[PDB]
Design a protein around this nucleic acid. Structure first.
Ligand SMILES: [Lu+3]
Ligand SMILES: [Lu+3]
Ligand code: NA
Ligand code: NA
Lengths: 244, 244
DNA sequence: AAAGATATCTTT
DNA sequence: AAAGATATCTTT
């Protein structure tokens, strides 16, 4: 399938290639820093050609946002059924030591999740799937030889601010949790779990409908949630009481 | 000086070199996307070696943050004068067309400027200067050819999602304005002005003392500010009224 | 101008 | 777990 070919290609690329710098048109190479913003950007850029290649091998049109701050990173559709769009969005987190539990921020719960055309490239109801490409890496403190510049013949001497990168491809709803992933920026939180649990899809929601209803009716603060619901057990009880 | 040599080095490097991709150790190149996060990341990485080079020339130790989400990008100090630290922080914004007005988010006003040890590498009172390296670029729409990978012999063929990059170095207080640069994340706003106004230092504060006091007593929402002050004129009146 | 969007982290 | 930090943008 498109999905299985895509993760196979991302999984293979990550095994075979290690990003180590930014390069200029005249051949000068600048190393990577350890800032979380650095690595998320690097993995996103690493993923773009792979996503496109696989999409094209399956006959899908590939579109990135035209406007800044619109979800998703990639919209795929076949021109013969333009209202069965696939959203693919790339997310990154870290571990301090290899294979500890991780969590992702899975997008806002007050933008396109509640408003069909808000912060989204196409209307939300044109998408039939929402895929997360998730990267996890183990952090590595920078070295001072990371403050030098390099030429193409020194590529293997450049220190990398990361190790143990792993990648997965999963549906957003499947890995969604019941606790917000941020406060002032009102993000959906993923399960808090090991990498394997994301691969295997060991989530909490019964259905994508239940995921959407949970996060459409999640209140923004602890005080507000306390009289409605704060977790999935309380939500399922709120539902049995008749959404009171 | 450290300052004059740094700005000269930053101007010369940006004239000379155009970043066009990320490179793997195996030699494969992945192009740049247009996302705002991408360019900011690339300009920061481009700047690191230049900052370290000039700082070392002038006998300054260079330290980047050890923890994520600490200001500033670079802390410089002479080993003999560890209580005269210089903060150098890199900021980026865009224009749609060449030489439009720009504005910057100049950091939080509720973290280190109100709590000496909050979200900062060293205590705020150990810094005697806060320099912004500001980057400005004009956006260029991405090409479909930004979705393939390239080799080291194709560097000039890679499309770039920017043009017209300009850089300045200025004191934070000098370019600061009186209107927040963000809402929920409570950032100081720069002046809203043309590039040369940043180079020349055409700000609104009389002194760094006035800059600090203004942003240390700025309330977080319009409603709360309407009984206090919303702009520099209203702040000067608040001072006259007796800081009440 | 004001506020809440973009992604992810740390603090409490 | 809650909420406000990290940088910058768009919508109001
Ligand atoms: Lu993205
Ligand atoms: Lu920075
Ligand atoms: Na790799
Ligand atoms: Na350049």
């Amino acid at each position: 399938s498109l999905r299985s070919d895509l993760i196979n290609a991302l999984y293979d690329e990550n095994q075979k290639y290690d990003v180590c710098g930014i390069i200029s048109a005249e051949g000068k190479i600048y190393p990577l820093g350890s800032d979380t913003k650095v690595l998320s950007t690097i993995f996103e850029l690493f993923s773009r050609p792979i996503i496109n290649k696989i999409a094209e091998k399956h006959g899908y049109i590939v579109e990135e946002p035209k406007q800044q701050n619109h979800y998703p990173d990639f919209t795929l559709y076949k021109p013969s059924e333009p209202n069965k769009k696939i959203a693919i969005d790339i997310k990154t987190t870290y571990t301090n030591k290899e294979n500890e539990k991780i969590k992702f921020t899975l997008g806002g719960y007050t933008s396109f999740i509640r408003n069909n055309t808000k912060n989204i490239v196409y209307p939300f109801d044109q998408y039939i799937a929402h895929w997360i490409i998730g990267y996890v890496y183990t952090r590595v403190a920078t070295r001072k030889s990371s403050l030098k510049t390099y030429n193409i013949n020194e590529l293997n001497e450049i220190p990398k601010p990361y190790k143990g990168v792993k990648v997965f491809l999963q549906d957003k709803w499947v890995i969604a949790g019941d606790l917000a992933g941020s406060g002032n920026t009102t993000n959906i939180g993923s399960i808090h779990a090991h990498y394997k649990d994301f691969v295997e899809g060991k989530g909490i929601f019964d259905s994508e409908d239940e995921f959407l209803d949970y996060w459409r009716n999640y209140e923004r603060t602890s005080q507000l949630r306390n009289d409605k619901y704060n977790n999935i057990s309380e939500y399922r009880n709120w539902i049995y009481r008749g959404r009171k």
